[PDB]
């Protein structure tokens, strides 16, 4: 799929993902949720080749849910991100690699800190205050480089995110049909229904 954005503020991680799904000539859907909850305090958004994206996301989801039941314990965002990276690093030298890029937004309950990880299909992991995949960063990073602070509130993070989406809607050729925004904090994961 197309645009996925991420920003880590003071006490939460915010992920924004486009709603459009395009089969070449036509836009088949305008309400697609490009994310999966891996654990109560960990969310993963994704974009890449059709089919592979959902198949990979659900495979990861199943593995983390299995771990949660076995140990009766939630893995840290760092631990989940490392597991996901290894799977993609394994995948890139396979017969047919997963063509999937992901952002992992999680709140570490032990350290009481939000964490955002950017991982591409090669298995290239980086921890960032804000991140993106594809062409999304080319438009948005200049705005984030200017306005971003580590001590921003969740509301300020959403406002900065609106400015990023507005710039995308102005300068990108493709109509991505807006974004679904989700917030990850100490209380868990929730969706912003009006954006």
């Amino acid at each position: 799929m197309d645009i996925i954005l991420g920003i880590r503020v003071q006490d939460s991680v915010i992920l924004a993902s486009s709603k459009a799904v395009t089969r070449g000539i036509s836009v088949l859907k305008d309400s697609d949720d490009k994310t999966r909850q891996l654990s109560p305090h960990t969310l993963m958004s994704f974009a890449g080749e059709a089919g592979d994206t959902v198949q990979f996301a659900e495979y990861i989801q199943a593995n983390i849910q299995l771990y949660s039941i076995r140990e009766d314990y939630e893995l840290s965002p760092q631990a989940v991100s490392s597991f996901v990276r290894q799977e993609l690093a394994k995948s890139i030298r396979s017969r047919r690699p997963y063509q999937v890029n992901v952002l992992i937004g999680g709140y570490d309950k032990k350290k009481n800190k939000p964490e955002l990880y950017q991982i591409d299909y090669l298995g290239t992991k980086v921890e960032l205050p804000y991140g993106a995949h594809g062409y999304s960063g080319f438009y948005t990073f200049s705005l984030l480089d200017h306005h971003y602070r580590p001590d921003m509130t969740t509301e300020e993070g959403l406002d900065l995110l609106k400015l990023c989406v507005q710039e995308l809607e102005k300068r990108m050729p493709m109509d991505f049909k807006g974004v679904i925004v989700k917030i990850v904090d100490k209380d868990g994961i929730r969706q912003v229904d009006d954006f």
């Binding site: 990276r85 993609l88 690093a89 030298r93 591409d120 980086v126 991140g131 960063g137 080319f138």
Partner: protein, 204 residues
């Protein structure tokens, strides 16, 4: 397309009087797009230091692999691995993937704990060992680094003098490479103390 120049980056190592130095830039990119200015390329297992340039996923994978192997080494051997021995392990590990290689440019640096002798080594992506007396270079600005090192370097430099030489070699090489820069780190290594210095450089 070329795996060794997608992410960019550089590593350089030098020997001095009773010391060694290893340094690297901090950039990680997706071709033209700068992604991270905190991607450190130098790792250490005990007193042995390893710098790795090239494809970033392989950089991360190999670090995790050599941490894995040096930890098992230590448990069985009941001692920390030495630079000469580690160099052979890196070579062996890379060559086992002869026809499906990790797209990397590793650089080993350290001092032998028993003999006290300074040691550096470089490799190609498939295992060949370059054990130079003077200096080793790696990454997307290796040509630039060769030019800097070949003119700036002199033998038997004191730790604090060696710091200046290797820093200037890295900085000016990085500034002539689009895919390198965005910060830098320098390790000064002596027999029983190691100093780590982050350098101030242009951020374009």
């Amino acid at each position: 397309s070329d795996p060794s120049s997608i992410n960019g980056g550089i590593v350089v190592a030098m020997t001095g009087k009773d010391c060694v130095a290893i340094a690297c830039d901090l950039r990680l990119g997706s071709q033209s797009l700068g992604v991270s200015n905190k991607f450190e390329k130098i790792f250490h297992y005990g007193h042995v230091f390893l710098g790795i340039t090239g494809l970033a996923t392989d950089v991360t994978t190999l670090n995790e692999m050599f941490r894995y192997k040096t930890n098992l080494y230590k448990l069985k051997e009941e001692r920390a691995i030495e630079p000469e021995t580690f160099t052979q392990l890196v070579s062996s590990s890379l060559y086992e993937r002869r026809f499906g290689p990790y797209f990397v440019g590793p650089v080993v640096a350290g001092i032998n704990s028993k003999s006290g002798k300074p040691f550096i080594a470089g490799f190609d992506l498939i295992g060949c060992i370059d054990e130079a007396k003077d200096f080793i270079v790696s990454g997307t600005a290796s040509d630039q680094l060769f030019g800097m090192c070949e003119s700036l370097y002199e033998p038997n430099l004191e730790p604090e003098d060696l710091f200046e030489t290797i820093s200037q070699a890295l900085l000016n090489a990085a500034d002539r490479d689009a895919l390198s820069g965005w910060g830098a780190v320098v390790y000064i290594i002596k027999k029983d103390e190691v100093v780590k210095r982050y350098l101030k450089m242009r951020q374009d």
